[PDB]
Structure formats: structure tokens, C-alpha cells
Design an enzyme around this catalytic site. Structure first.
Site, PDB file in Angstrom:
ATOM      1  N   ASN A   1       0.815  -1.228   0.000  1.00  0.00           N
ATOM      2  CA  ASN A   1       0.000   0.000   0.000  1.00  0.00           C
ATOM      3  C   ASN A   1       0.851   1.283   0.000  1.00  0.00           C
ATOM      4  O   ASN A   1       0.314   2.365   0.246  1.00  0.00           O
ATOM      5  CB  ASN A   1      -0.970   0.012   1.181  1.00  0.00           C
ATOM      6  CG  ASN A   1      -1.885  -1.194   1.216  1.00  0.00           C
ATOM      7  OD1 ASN A   1      -2.036  -1.855   2.248  1.00  0.00           O
ATOM      8  ND2 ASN A   1      -2.489  -1.521   0.081  1.00  0.00           N
TER       9      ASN A   1
ATOM     10  N   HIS B   1       3.149   2.241   2.090  1.00  0.00           N
ATOM     11  CA  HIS B   1       3.449   2.724   3.432  1.00  0.00           C
ATOM     12  C   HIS B   1       4.767   2.065   3.864  1.00  0.00           C
ATOM     13  O   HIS B   1       5.038   0.924   3.479  1.00  0.00           O
ATOM     14  CB  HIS B   1       2.329   2.317   4.409  1.00  0.00           C
ATOM     15  CG  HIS B   1       1.113   3.180   4.295  1.00  0.00           C
ATOM     16  ND1 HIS B   1       0.964   4.317   5.067  1.00  0.00           N
ATOM     17  CD2 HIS B   1       0.072   3.099   3.433  1.00  0.00           C
ATOM     18  CE1 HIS B   1      -0.167   4.886   4.666  1.00  0.00           C
ATOM     19  NE2 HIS B   1      -0.738   4.193   3.682  1.00  0.00           N
TER      20      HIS B   1
ATOM     21  N   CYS C   1       6.452   7.262   9.253  1.00  0.00           N
ATOM     22  CA  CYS C   1       7.438   7.980   8.463  1.00  0.00           C
ATOM     23  C   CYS C   1       6.842   7.917   7.048  1.00  0.00           C
ATOM     24  O   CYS C   1       6.500   6.826   6.578  1.00  0.00           O
ATOM     25  CB  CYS C   1       8.800   7.284   8.518  1.00  0.00           C
ATOM     26  SG  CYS C   1       9.998   7.887   7.289  1.00  0.00           S
TER      27      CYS C   1
END
Ligand code: 8EJ
Ligand code: 8EJ
Lengths: 265, 264
Positions: free
Chosen positions: A186, A188, A223
Site C-alpha cells: 500500500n 506505506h 514515516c
């Protein structure tokens, strides 16, 4: 891999790969954490998920990791087979917990254990929330009803409060940035990348002379792909203990805090 | 995994993992390259290697990658089983070659292919050298004697000369540094990390709208654990790019390569 007889836990065997091991020819803790994630994903798929429930997808809610705690007694060697058993448990309205037990496939002995706390969040606003009754009723049929803990002990390390490291840090690794291999499907940052970043500020001499026994990591904020991180470490201690902090390089926004315990080889 | 009937090649099946895939839910090229290394290591172990021969260990000699070339027709999906066959061949005094064929386990169709050139180097002085008759005779019993090529085609992409990118680069990613997960068991940067670094300077829009079909990478010098790298890319065109990795400080070349991408 497969669900166990009662359908309340899942087991999978992994053969440790050449690129998965460090200098001692045994699996790194990041390899272990990736295997934990993989068996968790295979468990969710086996019980019908795709781990968002039907009510969660409707409300745009997802599970996110709040804490990861891992204790390793023996790291599996390159070519060895490790068996990992995993299960989930509801923790009322706070969230859910996923636990793991690692065993050597040949000897059958417990070589490690791990536990993780997950909280519900809105995917879009990033707002954390408590677990609703409808969601709790939908995943309880996949969990053991009586408590089953990888860390049963009374004042065990997995639930200890972690303080915030104060400047100046004893050691640091500055300007850490994720690359595409650090991202999940995804886009991330993968939870295991943060473990690698925490460990980067431990001096190489500690890594060369000690074995990592325990790591506890709190996840506060993610992050982003274009963010830059600083990793800070201070010794707090035959054993060595450290306090860790990851923060954004610019404004100093905390993304993670943790502790590690190391034993002299 | 296991050696084939004749003992001249090795096969292994892999189930693609959740953390091994990108945004299309299919294996990244770095996952493929790691699998290629893994099956190569399992092949070397199965035929009795430490892939250093007895003579090699005595004169402190090792094999090092000079070039990697990979062509993917279909990336395996998350949960799919991919079968990889690998074998080695001697290339006279120049060095050795390791080839691979990737197949979907269910359909049996070829989904990818790869080839790599390896050269002999003294592990201490880092001096390259030709293969002696003694070393070449010791590993020929593990190779097919007739040529067996993953890339047979005349004048094919795997043997093409790669030019040096000229400044200014069209795109760049600066200040790339390895972390402990990028290192192998001997504390050297893993060959697959350089592939990831090359790809970092391709714009995200190309990655979101194209499929990587071919990557050719030359390895000139290693990035040490305390080194910092800059990744440079210029479009030369399907979309084709020229790549260059160099040390951030002095601009010393570590790799050069090309990639070919097809519009989704
Ligand atoms: C077992 C182990 C020790 C150290 C590290 C590291 N990244 O420093 C990873 N895994
Ligand atoms: C298949 C594929 C495409 C792009 C990348 C990358 N790192 O940009 C990796 N793998």
C-alpha cells in the site's frame, strides 16, 4: 501453513535463506519480524479476511501497530527450518493483540516469542478510536475465548512503559530515508524498517560482541515515503540495555521509542 | 529444492510473500533478484561447495559479479508459487556464467529469465584475474558441457555494451546509504541493494504507469558500509533509461546500467 485443529491459531514453517542471515550465519531480528508479519497475513487470509472485517471496510477503519515486543533465545541458522504459531485475542475496547511462538522444527524447543498491540484507526483522517461492539463480535469467533499469552509473567518486559530519550543522545545515525524496497503493497513504510532504523544507532562493536535478546518498540506516527529520520540511542545499563528514539530529521517529531536488551556472547 | 536428474542443474519452488510485493500485488524485481541468489546458493551447496573451489580457498580467490541481466514477462503474484531452474557454465579463461529460468508452477510457462557474468578476484588485494586451468577443471564436472543459454538469440540485450551517463543527469536520488539489512553474511553490500539504488532515481510516475521488462547492470566497484551513493538516470528512448551509481563525494563509478519499461 495451516490453521490448527480447533481453527483458533495458525502454524507455518520457513527455511532460513542465505540473504536473511547476519555475520553469525543466523537470521537477523528483521528477518524474524518479516516472518512474524508473513505468518500473521497467512492467518488472516485463512480465516476469510482481506485483516479488516466487513464492518471495518464500510467505516474506512484499519488496524495499525501500536507496539511490537520480541524475545529471541536462539536465532535459527541459515538452512534451518523454524515453525511459527500465531493467534489473536480481543483486548476489550482498547484494541487487539497478536501473539507468536517460534520453535526449532527438528528439536521442537521454543526459540523465541513475540507479542504486538494493534489499535483501530480511520484510514483517511488517521484518528485513533476504541473498538465498537459490532467489530468485536465479528472477529471473536476467530480468537481463543480464554486468555492465551505468549508472555504470561506478572511484571514482564512486554508491558513496560518506555521513557523519552533526552538530548544529547550517546549515539546517533542521522539522515535515514526509506527506499522502494522499504514500502509495503500500500506504499506505506513496512513496520520492520523502523526496527532496522532503531538498531542502526547501536555501535557496531556491541553488535559484534553481543546477541540481541529483547526489543520493545512503540509506534507513534508513521514515516512518510519523502520523510528523513534520525535514530538516537543511549545506554541505560554481563547484559547491556539501551533506550532508543526515532524522530523526523527536521522538526524532531517523534515517530518511535523503544528499548533493547543485549547479552555478551 | 533439488538437483535435476543429470545433476547439471538445480530447481527450487518459492511461494511469494506479503512483504515481497509492490503496489500491483506482484513480486518486485529486488524480490526476484534475491530468489535468484538464494537458488544459486542452494545449487552451490548441493554440489559440495563452501561457491569457492578447493584451489580457490588456498590462493584466497573468490567469484564476484561483473554483470546481472534480468528479463521478466510476468511478475508472480502474492501467494503464487514460482519455480526457478539454475545452472553454471564455464566461459574459458574469462570467468563463469550463471543462468536462470523462472516458471509459473501451475501453468508451467516461462515467466522470466536471467544471466550473470562472474569474474575471479583475490579477496585481499581485490585484483581481478583470469581463470586458471586447475580451477576451471574442478568446476566443469558440475556444468553442462554443451552450451545451454537462457539468452540464446544473436546480438541479444544481455551482451550489449553500456555507455557512461554524461552530466547533467535528467533525474537523481542523492545520498543513498546502506543499513545493516543491506549487508550479506560477510558484511559486504548485497548485490540486490545496487538494483534498488539504480531504480530509486526513476520517477514514481514511470513506476506507477509502466512495468519493468528488462534490467542490465554492470558492477565496477563495491560500495563499502560507510560509503554514500548518488543514483543518476536519463531517458534514452516503451521507455528506456541509462543509469549510473557513483560515490557521493569523489564521483567514483560503482555501477552503470539500462532499464526497459513497457506502458501498462
Ligand atoms: C539479530 C540482529 C542483531 C542486530 C541487528 C541490527 N540491524 O543491528 C539485526 N539483527
Ligand atoms: C518490478 C519492480 C518495479 C520497480 C521497482 C523499484 N524499486 O522501483 C522494483 N520492482
Amino acid at each position: 501453513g495451516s490453521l490448527t485443529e480447533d481453527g483458533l491459531s495458525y502454524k507455518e514453517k520457513f527455511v532460513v535463506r542465505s540473504y536473511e542471515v547476519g555475520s553469525n550465519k543466523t537470521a537477523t531480528v528483521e528477518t524474524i519480524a518479516n516472518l512474524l508479519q508473513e505468518v500473521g497475513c497467512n492467518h488472516a487470509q485463512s480465516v476469510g479476511f482481506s485483516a479488516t472485517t466487513t464492518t471495518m471496510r464500510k467505516l474506512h477503519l484499519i488496524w495499525v501497530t501500536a507496539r511490537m515486543h520480541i524475545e529471541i533465545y536462539k536465532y535459527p541458522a541459515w538452512g534451518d527450518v523454524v515453525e511459527i504459531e500465531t493467534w489473536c485475542q480481543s483486548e476489550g475496547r482498547i484494541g487487539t493483540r497478536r501473539d507468536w511462538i517460534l520453535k526449532d522444527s527438528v528439536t521442537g524447543e521454543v526459540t523465541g516469542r513475540a507479542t504486538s498491540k494493534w489499535v483501530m484507526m480511520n484510514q483517511d483522517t488517521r484518528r485513533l478510536q476504541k473498538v465498537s461492539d459490532d467489530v468485536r463480535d465479528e472477529y471473536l469467533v476467530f480468537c481463543p475465548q480464554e486468555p492465551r499469552l505468549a508472555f504470561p509473567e506478572e511484571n514482564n518486559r512486554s508491558l513496560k512503559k518506555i521513557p523519552k530519550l533526552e538530548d544529547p543522545a550517546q549515539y546517533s545515525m542521522i539522515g535515514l530515508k526509506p527506499r522502494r524496497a522499504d514500502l509495503d503493497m500500500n506504499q506505506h513504510v513496512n513496520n520492520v524498517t523502523y526496527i532496522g532504523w532503531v538498531l542502526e544507532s547501536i555501535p557496531q562493536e556491541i553488535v559484534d560482541t553481543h546477541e540481541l535478546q529483547v526489543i520493545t518498540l512503540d509506534y507513534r506516527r508513521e514515516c512518510q515515503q519523502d520523510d528523513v529520520v534520525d535514530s538516537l540511542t543511549t545506554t541505560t545499563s554481563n547484559d547491556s540495555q539501551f533506550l532508543h528514539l526515532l524522530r523526523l530529521s527536521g522538526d524532531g517529531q517523534e515517530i518511535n521509542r523503544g528499548t533493547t536488551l543485549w547479552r555478551k556472547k
